[PDB]
Protein backbone atom coordinates (compact mmCIF):
# COMPACT_ATOMS: atom_id res chain seq x y z
CA UNK A 1 0.00 0.00 0.00
CA UNK A 2 2.57 2.54 1.24
CA UNK A 3 0.18 5.39 1.97
CA UNK A 4 1.72 8.82 2.63
CA UNK A 5 -0.31 10.88 5.09
CA UNK A 6 0.53 14.57 5.44
CA UNK A 7 -1.25 17.64 6.80
CA UNK A 8 0.05 21.15 6.08
CA UNK A 9 -1.19 24.33 7.76
CA UNK A 10 -0.30 27.86 6.63
CA UNK A 11 -1.61 30.70 8.81
CA UNK A 12 -0.63 34.11 7.41
CA UNK A 13 -0.60 37.60 8.90
CA UNK A 14 -1.99 40.68 7.21
CA UNK A 15 -1.11 44.27 6.46
CA UNK A 16 2.55 44.92 5.71
CA UNK A 17 3.43 41.83 7.77
CA UNK A 18 4.64 38.75 5.89
CA UNK A 19 4.75 36.33 8.81
CA UNK A 20 3.13 32.91 8.92
CA UNK A 21 2.47 29.94 11.18
CA UNK A 22 3.60 26.84 9.28
CA UNK A 23 3.04 23.45 10.91
CA UNK A 24 3.26 20.28 8.83
CA UNK A 25 2.99 16.57 9.58
CA UNK A 26 4.07 13.60 7.48
CA UNK A 27 3.56 9.88 8.03
CA UNK A 28 5.05 7.73 5.26
CA UNK A 29 5.06 3.97 5.83
CA UNK A 30 8.07 3.46 3.54
CA UNK A 31 11.74 2.66 4.16
CA UNK A 32 13.94 5.76 4.11
CA UNK A 33 16.96 5.71 1.81
CA UNK A 34 19.39 6.15 4.69
CA UNK A 35 22.28 3.64 4.68
CA UNK A 36 22.18 3.91 8.49
CA UNK A 37 18.90 3.26 10.32
CA UNK A 38 17.13 4.13 12.50
CA UNK A 39 17.74 7.84 11.83
CA UNK A 40 15.92 9.97 14.41
CA UNK A 41 16.52 13.71 14.14
CA UNK A 42 15.47 16.84 16.01
CA UNK A 43 15.99 20.27 14.44
CA UNK A 44 15.32 23.54 16.28
CA UNK A 45 15.88 26.96 14.73
CA UNK A 46 15.56 30.42 16.25
CA UNK A 47 16.38 33.98 15.19
CA UNK A 48 15.89 37.41 16.75
CA UNK A 49 17.25 40.88 15.90
CA UNK A 50 20.41 41.93 17.71
CA UNK A 51 20.48 45.56 16.55
CA UNK A 52 18.20 46.28 13.56
CA UNK A 53 20.02 49.61 13.21
CA UNK A 54 22.51 47.74 11.01
CA UNK A 55 20.82 44.38 10.48
CA UNK A 56 22.37 41.91 12.94
CA UNK A 57 20.07 39.00 13.76
CA UNK A 58 21.07 36.25 16.18
CA UNK A 59 20.07 33.01 14.43
CA UNK A 60 20.58 29.84 16.46
CA UNK A 61 20.10 26.31 15.14
CA UNK A 62 20.33 23.10 17.18
CA UNK A 63 20.41 19.74 15.39
CA UNK A 64 19.96 16.67 17.59
CA UNK A 65 20.04 13.27 15.93
CA UNK A 66 20.42 9.58 16.76
CA UNK A 67 21.48 7.60 13.67
CA UNK A 68 22.08 3.89 14.36
CA UNK A 69 22.33 4.55 18.11
CA UNK A 70 24.85 7.37 17.55
CA UNK A 71 23.76 10.58 19.28
CA UNK A 72 24.76 13.49 17.04
CA UNK A 73 24.37 17.13 18.05
CA UNK A 74 25.23 20.35 16.21
CA UNK A 75 24.47 23.72 17.81
CA UNK A 76 25.33 26.94 15.98
CA UNK A 77 24.73 30.62 16.72
CA UNK A 78 25.32 33.33 14.13
CA UNK A 79 25.00 37.11 13.90
CA UNK A 80 24.07 37.53 10.23
CA UNK A 81 23.41 40.87 8.55
CA UNK A 82 23.13 42.15 4.99
CA UNK A 83 26.13 44.47 4.72
CA UNK A 84 25.14 45.30 1.14
CA UNK A 85 22.36 44.48 -1.31
CA UNK A 86 24.64 41.74 -2.69
CA UNK A 87 26.97 41.19 0.29
CA UNK A 88 26.19 39.55 3.63
CA UNK A 89 28.33 39.25 6.76
CA UNK A 90 28.05 36.91 9.72
CA UNK A 91 29.89 35.95 12.90
CA UNK A 92 29.19 33.29 15.50
CA UNK A 93 30.19 30.04 17.15
CA UNK A 94 28.94 26.53 17.79
CA UNK A 95 29.81 22.99 18.76
CA UNK A 96 29.63 19.57 17.11
CA UNK A 97 29.23 16.45 19.23
CA UNK A 98 29.09 12.81 18.13
CA UNK A 99 28.99 10.29 20.96
CA UNK A 100 31.82 11.05 23.37
CA UNK A 101 33.65 13.25 20.86
CA UNK A 102 32.78 16.95 20.77
CA UNK A 103 34.66 19.87 19.24
CA UNK A 104 33.53 23.48 19.56
CA UNK A 105 34.02 26.02 16.79
CA UNK A 106 33.84 29.78 16.35
CA UNK A 107 33.77 31.45 12.97
CA UNK A 108 33.44 34.66 10.97
CA UNK A 109 32.28 34.54 7.37
CA UNK A 110 31.04 36.73 4.55
CA UNK A 111 28.96 35.49 1.62
CA UNK A 112 28.78 37.64 -1.51
CA UNK A 113 26.07 36.64 -3.99
CA UNK A 114 26.36 37.78 -7.61
CA UNK A 115 23.89 37.42 -10.47
CA UNK A 116 25.35 36.89 -13.93
CA UNK A 117 23.05 39.55 -15.41
CA UNK A 118 20.73 42.33 -14.27
CA UNK A 119 18.77 42.94 -17.46
CA UNK A 120 15.52 44.83 -16.94
CA UNK A 121 13.94 43.33 -20.07
CA UNK A 122 13.57 40.16 -18.00
CA UNK A 123 12.31 42.17 -15.02
CA UNK A 124 9.62 44.06 -16.96
CA UNK A 125 8.51 41.03 -19.02
CA UNK A 126 8.73 38.09 -16.58
CA UNK A 127 6.27 38.87 -13.76
CA UNK A 128 7.44 35.94 -11.60
CA UNK A 129 11.08 35.16 -12.39
CA UNK A 130 12.16 31.80 -10.96
CA UNK A 131 15.44 30.72 -12.55
CA UNK A 132 18.14 33.28 -11.72
CA UNK A 133 21.67 32.05 -12.39
CA UNK A 134 24.48 33.34 -10.22
CA UNK A 135 27.42 32.60 -7.96
CA UNK A 136 27.89 32.90 -4.20
CA UNK A 137 31.40 33.80 -3.02
CA UNK A 138 31.74 32.42 0.50
CA UNK A 139 34.68 33.83 2.46
CA UNK A 140 34.91 31.78 5.65
CA UNK A 141 37.22 32.37 8.61
CA UNK A 142 36.78 29.68 11.27
CA UNK A 143 38.71 29.04 14.48
CA UNK A 144 38.43 25.70 16.28
CA UNK A 145 40.10 25.05 19.66
CA UNK A 146 42.26 21.92 19.53
CA UNK A 147 41.72 20.22 22.90
CA UNK A 148 41.22 16.52 22.16
CA UNK A 149 44.06 14.48 20.70
CA UNK A 150 41.62 13.84 17.86
CA UNK A 151 41.54 17.58 17.16
CA UNK A 152 45.34 17.52 17.06
CA UNK A 153 45.23 14.56 14.68
CA UNK A 154 42.69 16.18 12.35
CA UNK A 155 44.63 19.46 12.26
CA UNK A 156 48.02 17.83 11.68
CA UNK A 157 46.68 15.51 9.00
CA UNK A 158 44.93 18.39 7.25
CA UNK A 159 47.99 20.66 7.23
CA UNK A 160 50.22 17.80 6.07
CA UNK A 161 47.75 16.96 3.29
CA UNK A 162 47.59 20.60 2.17
CA UNK A 163 51.38 20.82 2.13
CA UNK A 164 51.76 17.50 0.33
CA UNK A 165 49.25 17.40 -2.53
CA UNK A 166 48.41 20.25 -4.90
CA UNK A 167 44.99 18.76 -5.68
CA UNK A 168 43.65 19.32 -2.16
CA UNK A 169 41.58 22.23 -3.51
CA UNK A 170 39.42 20.01 -5.74
CA UNK A 171 39.69 16.68 -3.90
CA UNK A 172 38.25 18.28 -0.75
CA UNK A 173 34.88 18.38 -2.54
CA UNK A 174 34.85 14.58 -2.37
CA UNK A 175 35.25 14.79 1.41
CA UNK A 176 33.20 17.98 1.81
CA UNK A 177 30.02 16.47 0.32
CA UNK A 178 29.74 13.07 1.97
CA UNK A 179 27.80 10.41 0.07
CA UNK A 180 24.93 11.47 -2.18
CA UNK A 181 25.46 15.15 -1.36
CA UNK A 182 27.78 15.30 -4.37
CA UNK A 183 25.05 14.02 -6.69
CA UNK A 184 22.60 16.45 -5.08
CA UNK A 185 24.98 19.28 -5.96
CA UNK A 186 24.79 18.44 -9.65
CA UNK A 187 21.05 17.80 -9.76
CA UNK A 188 20.28 21.09 -8.05
CA UNK A 189 22.38 23.04 -10.53
CA UNK A 190 25.05 23.82 -7.93
CA UNK A 191 28.75 23.69 -8.74
CA UNK A 192 31.45 24.00 -6.09
CA UNK A 193 34.60 25.72 -7.27
CA UNK A 194 37.99 24.60 -6.01
CA UNK A 195 38.36 26.10 -2.54
CA UNK A 196 41.09 28.70 -2.01
CA UNK A 197 42.75 27.90 1.32
CA UNK A 198 44.19 31.28 2.32
CA UNK A 199 46.14 29.89 5.28
CA UNK A 200 45.95 27.27 8.03
CA UNK A 201 47.74 28.52 11.14
CA UNK A 202 47.43 27.56 14.80
CA UNK A 203 48.00 29.84 17.79
CA UNK A 204 47.81 29.28 21.53
CA UNK A 205 44.42 30.74 22.42
CA UNK A 206 42.88 31.15 25.87
CA UNK A 207 43.39 27.58 27.11
CA UNK A 208 45.24 25.88 24.25
CA UNK A 209 46.01 25.87 20.54
CA UNK A 210 43.27 26.99 18.16
CA UNK A 211 43.16 26.01 14.50
CA UNK A 212 42.43 29.19 12.53
CA UNK A 213 41.84 28.44 8.86
CA UNK A 214 41.04 31.03 6.21
CA UNK A 215 39.33 29.54 3.18
CA UNK A 216 36.85 30.56 0.52
CA UNK A 217 34.86 28.98 -2.29
CA UNK A 218 32.50 30.13 -5.03
CA UNK A 219 29.46 27.89 -5.52
CA UNK A 220 27.33 28.73 -8.54
CA UNK A 221 23.81 28.13 -9.72
CA UNK A 222 22.05 27.21 -12.95
CA UNK A 223 18.88 28.90 -11.71
CA UNK A 224 17.33 26.20 -9.53
CA UNK A 225 19.69 26.90 -6.64
CA UNK A 226 17.82 28.52 -3.77
CA UNK A 227 20.79 30.17 -2.07
CA UNK A 228 21.50 32.30 -5.18
CA UNK A 229 18.30 32.88 -7.17
CA UNK A 230 16.45 34.04 -4.03
CA UNK A 231 19.34 35.57 -2.09
CA UNK A 232 17.30 38.55 -0.88
CA UNK A 233 14.27 36.34 -0.10
CA UNK A 234 15.80 33.59 2.06
CA UNK A 235 17.02 36.15 4.63
CA UNK A 236 14.16 38.53 5.52
CA UNK A 237 16.16 40.69 7.92
CA UNK A 238 14.27 43.88 7.03
CA UNK A 239 10.86 42.34 7.80
CA UNK A 240 11.89 40.61 11.03
CA UNK A 241 10.59 42.22 14.22
CA UNK A 242 10.26 39.45 16.84
CA UNK A 243 11.81 36.05 17.62
CA UNK A 244 11.14 33.61 14.79
CA UNK A 245 11.15 29.88 15.47
CA UNK A 246 11.05 26.72 13.36
CA UNK A 247 10.99 23.31 15.07
CA UNK A 248 11.49 20.43 12.63
CA UNK A 249 12.51 16.82 13.23
CA UNK A 250 11.73 13.33 11.99
CA UNK A 251 11.48 9.97 13.72
CA UNK A 252 12.53 7.38 11.15
CA UNK A 253 13.15 3.64 11.23
CA UNK A 254 13.40 0.71 8.84
CA UNK A 255 9.65 0.70 8.13
CA UNK A 256 8.39 4.28 8.28
CA UNK A 257 9.10 8.00 8.18
CA UNK A 258 7.36 10.36 10.61
CA UNK A 259 7.85 14.11 10.12
CA UNK A 260 6.57 17.01 12.24
CA UNK A 261 7.76 20.56 11.51
CA UNK A 262 6.48 23.71 13.22
CA UNK A 263 7.13 27.26 12.15
CA UNK A 264 7.04 30.97 12.94
CA UNK A 265 8.85 33.32 10.57
CA UNK A 266 8.39 36.13 8.01
CA UNK A 267 8.69 35.65 4.27
CA UNK A 268 5.92 33.05 4.03
CA UNK A 269 3.91 35.49 1.90
CA UNK A 270 5.74 37.82 -0.48
CA UNK A 271 4.22 40.62 -2.54
CA UNK A 272 3.66 39.21 -6.02
CA UNK A 273 3.68 42.73 -7.49
CA UNK A 274 1.42 45.76 -7.27
CA UNK A 275 -0.16 45.00 -3.90
CA UNK A 276 -0.94 41.38 -4.78
CA UNK A 277 0.45 39.07 -2.11
CA UNK A 278 1.35 35.45 -2.76
CA UNK A 279 2.76 32.44 -0.99
CA UNK A 280 6.46 32.53 -1.78
CA UNK A 281 7.43 30.50 -4.83
CA UNK A 282 8.32 27.05 -3.58
CA UNK A 283 12.05 26.67 -2.79
CA UNK A 284 13.22 24.39 -5.57
CA UNK A 285 16.35 22.91 -3.97
CA UNK A 286 14.41 21.02 -1.24
CA UNK A 287 12.13 19.57 -3.91
CA UNK A 288 14.91 18.44 -6.24
CA UNK A 289 17.00 17.13 -3.32
CA UNK A 290 14.06 15.11 -2.02
CA UNK A 291 13.88 14.07 -5.69
CA UNK A 292 16.51 11.36 -5.60
CA UNK A 293 14.93 9.97 -2.42
CA UNK A 294 11.18 10.29 -2.96
CA UNK A 295 11.08 8.22 -6.15
CA UNK A 296 12.05 4.88 -4.57
CA UNK A 297 8.49 3.83 -3.70
CA UNK A 298 5.10 4.33 -5.31
CA UNK A 299 2.80 5.84 -2.71
CA UNK A 300 -0.82 6.79 -2.15
CA UNK A 301 -1.03 10.39 -0.94
CA UNK A 302 -3.81 11.99 1.11
CA UNK A 303 -2.31 15.45 1.57
CA UNK A 304 -4.26 18.24 3.27
CA UNK A 305 -3.11 21.84 2.86
CA UNK A 306 -4.95 24.20 5.21
CA UNK A 307 -4.06 27.78 4.28
CA UNK A 308 -5.62 30.26 6.71
CA UNK A 309 -5.62 33.80 5.32
CA UNK A 310 -6.06 36.81 7.60
CA UNK A 311 -9.38 38.61 7.82
CA UNK A 312 -10.52 40.42 4.69
CA UNK A 313 -7.95 38.55 2.57
CA UNK A 314 -9.44 36.87 -0.49
CA UNK A 315 -7.73 34.57 -2.99
CA UNK A 316 -7.28 34.45 -6.75
CA UNK A 317 -5.60 31.99 -9.13
CA UNK A 318 -5.15 28.93 -6.95
CA UNK A 319 -3.64 26.26 -9.21
CA UNK A 320 -4.40 23.54 -8.26
CA UNK A 321 -7.66 25.04 -7.00
CA UNK A 322 -8.54 24.92 -3.32
CA UNK A 323 -10.85 22.00 -2.64
CA UNK A 324 -12.96 23.36 0.23
CA UNK A 325 -13.23 26.72 1.97
CA UNK A 326 -14.43 28.20 5.25
CA UNK A 327 -13.94 31.92 4.57
CA UNK A 328 -10.16 32.03 5.33
CA UNK A 329 -9.48 28.36 6.03
CA UNK A 330 -8.92 27.41 2.40
CA UNK A 331 -8.19 23.71 2.10
CA UNK A 332 -6.40 21.75 -0.62
CA UNK A 333 -7.09 18.02 -0.65
CA UNK A 334 -7.34 15.30 -3.28
CA UNK A 335 -7.98 15.88 -6.95
CA UNK A 336 -5.26 17.94 -8.60
CA UNK A 337 -3.70 18.97 -5.28
CA UNK A 338 -2.84 15.42 -4.18
CA UNK A 339 -1.49 14.87 -7.69
CA UNK A 340 0.75 17.93 -7.31
CA UNK A 341 1.83 16.70 -3.87
CA UNK A 342 2.88 13.36 -5.34
CA UNK A 343 4.63 15.25 -8.14
CA UNK A 344 6.68 17.39 -5.75
CA UNK A 345 7.35 14.54 -3.29
CA UNK A 346 8.85 12.55 -6.16
CA UNK A 347 11.04 15.55 -7.04
CA UNK A 348 8.69 17.64 -9.15
CA UNK A 349 9.13 21.34 -9.77
CA UNK A 350 5.58 22.13 -10.88
CA UNK A 351 4.22 25.49 -9.80
CA UNK A 352 1.45 25.85 -7.21
CA UNK A 353 0.94 29.60 -6.80
CA UNK A 354 -1.53 31.12 -4.32
CA UNK A 355 -2.16 34.76 -5.30
CA UNK A 356 -4.04 36.30 -2.37
CA UNK A 357 -4.93 39.88 -1.48
CA UNK A 358 -7.66 41.73 0.40
CA UNK B 1 -9.51 16.17 23.00
CA UNK B 2 -11.01 13.85 25.61
CA UNK B 3 -12.75 16.42 27.78
CA UNK B 4 -15.37 16.86 25.06
CA UNK B 5 -16.24 13.16 25.06
CA UNK B 6 -16.25 13.44 28.85
CA UNK B 7 -18.77 16.30 28.45
CA UNK B 8 -20.88 15.03 25.55
CA UNK B 9 -21.35 11.94 27.71
CA UNK B 10 -21.22 14.18 30.78
CA UNK B 11 -23.96 16.42 29.42
CA UNK B 12 -26.04 13.42 28.36
CA UNK B 13 -25.74 11.68 31.73
CA UNK B 14 -26.74 14.99 33.33
CA UNK B 15 -29.93 14.86 31.26
CA UNK B 16 -30.37 11.25 32.34
CA UNK B 17 -30.14 12.26 35.99
CA UNK B 18 -32.26 15.38 35.35
CA UNK B 19 -35.19 13.98 33.35
CA UNK B 20 -35.30 11.03 35.75
CA UNK B 21 -35.19 13.38 38.76
CA UNK B 22 -38.04 15.63 37.60
CA UNK B 23 -40.33 12.68 36.85
CA UNK B 24 -40.52 12.08 40.61
CA UNK B 25 -41.58 15.72 41.16
CA UNK B 26 -44.00 16.36 38.27
CA UNK B 27 -46.55 14.04 39.84
CA UNK B 28 -47.96 11.83 37.09
CA UNK B 29 -49.82 8.53 36.88
CA UNK B 30 -47.78 6.20 34.61
CA UNK B 31 -49.06 3.63 32.13
CA UNK B 32 -51.47 0.97 33.49
CA UNK B 33 -48.73 -1.69 33.71
CA UNK B 34 -45.46 0.21 34.05
CA UNK B 35 -42.82 1.23 36.58
CA UNK B 36 -41.96 4.85 37.37
CA UNK B 37 -38.24 4.02 37.49
CA UNK B 38 -37.94 3.12 33.80
CA UNK B 39 -40.76 5.06 32.10
CA UNK B 40 -38.92 8.45 32.18
CA UNK B 41 -35.64 6.75 31.29
CA UNK B 42 -37.13 5.32 28.09
CA UNK B 43 -38.33 8.77 27.00
CA UNK B 44 -34.94 10.27 27.85
CA UNK B 45 -33.18 7.56 25.83
CA UNK B 46 -35.43 8.25 22.85
CA UNK B 47 -34.84 12.00 23.15
CA UNK B 48 -31.07 11.60 23.45
CA UNK B 49 -31.04 9.12 20.56
CA UNK B 50 -32.92 11.66 18.43
CA UNK B 51 -30.41 14.42 19.15
CA UNK B 52 -27.39 12.13 18.85
CA UNK B 53 -28.62 10.63 15.57
CA UNK B 54 -29.22 14.09 14.12
CA UNK B 55 -25.75 15.23 15.22
CA UNK B 56 -23.98 12.15 13.85
CA UNK B 57 -25.89 12.42 10.57
CA UNK B 58 -24.78 16.05 10.27
CA UNK B 59 -21.17 15.21 11.14
CA UNK B 60 -21.06 12.19 8.83
CA UNK B 61 -22.60 13.97 5.85
CA UNK B 62 -20.25 16.89 6.39
CA UNK B 63 -17.23 14.60 6.61
CA UNK B 64 -18.15 12.56 3.52
CA UNK B 65 -18.26 15.82 1.62
CA UNK B 66 -14.69 16.89 2.37
CA UNK B 67 -13.43 13.30 2.11
CA UNK B 68 -15.47 12.42 -0.99
CA UNK B 69 -13.45 12.56 -4.21
CA UNK B 70 -12.98 10.87 -7.57
CA UNK B 71 -11.52 7.89 -5.68
CA UNK B 72 -15.04 7.09 -4.41
CA UNK B 73 -16.07 5.69 -7.81
CA UNK B 74 -16.71 2.36 -6.10
CA UNK B 75 -17.95 1.85 -2.53
CA UNK B 76 -19.93 5.07 -2.79
CA UNK B 77 -22.68 3.29 -4.78
CA UNK B 78 -21.76 -0.01 -3.12
CA UNK B 79 -22.17 1.47 0.36
CA UNK B 80 -25.54 2.91 -0.68
CA UNK B 81 -26.51 -0.48 -2.11
CA UNK B 82 -25.51 -2.39 1.02
CA UNK B 83 -27.45 0.14 3.12
CA UNK B 84 -30.45 -0.52 0.88
CA UNK B 85 -29.92 -4.27 1.30
CA UNK B 86 -29.70 -4.11 5.09
CA UNK B 87 -32.84 -1.95 5.23
CA UNK B 88 -34.75 -4.35 2.97
CA UNK B 89 -33.62 -7.41 4.93
CA UNK B 90 -34.44 -5.73 8.25
CA UNK B 91 -37.89 -5.28 6.73
CA UNK B 92 -38.15 -9.09 6.95
CA UNK B 93 -35.90 -10.28 9.79
CA UNK B 94 -36.46 -7.51 12.35
CA UNK B 95 -39.38 -5.26 11.32
CA UNK B 96 -42.56 -7.15 10.40
CA UNK B 97 -40.84 -10.51 10.64
CA UNK B 98 -43.55 -12.19 8.55
CA UNK B 99 -46.07 -11.32 5.88
CA UNK B 100 -49.37 -10.76 7.67
CA UNK B 101 -51.58 -13.82 8.16
CA UNK B 102 -54.59 -14.54 10.35
CA UNK B 103 -54.25 -15.94 13.86
CA UNK B 104 -54.88 -19.44 12.48
CA UNK B 105 -52.21 -18.88 9.80
CA UNK B 106 -54.37 -18.49 6.68
CA UNK B 107 -53.39 -16.08 3.92
CA UNK B 108 -55.92 -13.63 2.49
CA UNK B 109 -54.62 -11.93 -0.65
CA UNK B 110 -57.69 -11.10 -2.77
CA UNK B 111 -60.89 -9.15 -2.13
CA UNK B 112 -62.49 -12.10 -0.34
CA UNK B 113 -62.96 -10.01 2.81
CA UNK C 1 -10.77 2.27 -4.58
CA UNK C 2 -7.35 1.94 -6.19
CA UNK C 3 -3.90 3.51 -6.23
CA UNK C 4 -3.08 6.86 -7.84
CA UNK C 5 -3.77 5.93 -11.46
CA UNK C 6 -3.04 9.18 -13.35
CA UNK C 7 -3.78 7.82 -16.82
CA UNK C 8 -1.83 9.08 -19.83
CA UNK C 9 -3.26 8.87 -23.35
CA UNK C 10 -1.23 9.11 -26.54
CA UNK C 11 -1.33 7.91 -30.14
CA UNK C 12 1.46 7.78 -32.71
CA UNK C 13 1.23 7.38 -36.48
CA UNK C 14 4.11 6.74 -38.89
CA UNK C 15 3.59 6.53 -42.66
CA UNK C 16 6.68 5.62 -44.67
CA UNK C 17 7.68 5.84 -48.34
CA UNK C 18 9.00 3.12 -50.60
CA UNK C 19 12.14 2.56 -52.60
CA UNK C 20 15.29 4.47 -51.71
CA UNK C 21 13.14 7.21 -50.14
CA UNK C 22 13.51 7.64 -46.38
CA UNK C 23 10.62 10.04 -45.79
CA UNK C 24 7.88 9.53 -43.23
CA UNK C 25 4.68 11.17 -41.99
CA UNK C 26 4.91 11.18 -38.19
CA UNK C 27 1.76 12.17 -36.31
CA UNK C 28 1.56 12.16 -32.53
CA UNK C 29 -0.95 13.37 -29.96
CA UNK C 30 -0.62 12.98 -26.20
CA UNK C 31 -2.53 13.81 -23.04
CA UNK C 32 -1.07 13.33 -19.56
CA UNK C 33 -3.25 14.18 -16.56
CA UNK C 34 -0.26 15.12 -14.40
CA UNK C 35 1.21 18.47 -13.32
CA UNK C 36 4.10 19.49 -15.58
CA UNK C 37 7.46 20.00 -13.88
CA UNK C 38 7.67 23.70 -14.76
CA UNK C 39 8.13 26.38 -12.07
CA UNK C 40 5.94 28.75 -14.12
CA UNK C 41 2.51 27.53 -15.20
CA UNK C 42 0.59 27.42 -17.40
CA UNK C 43 3.01 27.01 -20.31
CA UNK C 44 2.21 26.86 -24.02
CA UNK C 45 4.39 26.49 -27.10
CA UNK C 46 3.92 26.37 -30.87
CA UNK C 47 6.98 24.90 -32.59
CA UNK C 48 7.25 25.25 -36.37
CA UNK C 49 10.06 23.62 -38.36
Amino acid sequence: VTTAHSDYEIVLEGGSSSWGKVKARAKVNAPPASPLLPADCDVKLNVKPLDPAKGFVRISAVFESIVDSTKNKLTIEADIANETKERRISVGEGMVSVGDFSHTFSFEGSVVNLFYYRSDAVRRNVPNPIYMQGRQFHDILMKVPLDNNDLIDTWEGTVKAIGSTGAFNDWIRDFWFIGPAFTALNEGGQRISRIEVNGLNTESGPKGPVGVSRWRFSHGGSGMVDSISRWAELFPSDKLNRPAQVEAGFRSDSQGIEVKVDGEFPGVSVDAGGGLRRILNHPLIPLVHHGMVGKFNNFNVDAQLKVVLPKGYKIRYAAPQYRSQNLEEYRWSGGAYARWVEHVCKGGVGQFEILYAQ
Amino acid sequence: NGKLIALAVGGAVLMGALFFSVSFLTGYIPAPNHSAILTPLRSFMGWFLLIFCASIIIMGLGKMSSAISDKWFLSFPLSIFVIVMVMFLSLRVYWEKGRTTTVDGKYIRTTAE
Amino acid sequence: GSNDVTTAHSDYEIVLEGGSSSWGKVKARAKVNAPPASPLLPADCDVKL
Binding site: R316, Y317, A318, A319, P320, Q321, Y322, R323, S324, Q325, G335, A336 | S65, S66, I68 | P42, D44
Partner: peptide, 15 residues
Protein backbone atom coordinates in the same frame (compact mmCIF):
# COMPACT_ATOMS: atom_id res chain seq x y z
CA UNK D 1 -4.74 34.19 -23.40
CA UNK D 2 -5.49 30.55 -22.63
CA UNK D 3 -4.17 31.13 -19.10
CA UNK D 4 -6.71 33.92 -18.50
CA UNK D 5 -9.62 31.52 -19.01
CA UNK D 6 -8.15 29.18 -16.40
CA UNK D 7 -7.33 32.18 -14.20
CA UNK D 8 -10.92 33.46 -14.35
CA UNK D 9 -12.67 30.21 -13.38
CA UNK D 10 -14.83 29.53 -10.35
CA UNK D 11 -13.64 26.74 -8.07
CA UNK D 12 -14.79 23.55 -9.83
CA UNK D 13 -13.47 21.12 -7.20
CA UNK D 14 -16.65 21.04 -5.12
CA UNK D 15 -17.80 17.74 -3.68
Amino acid sequence: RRFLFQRTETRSTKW
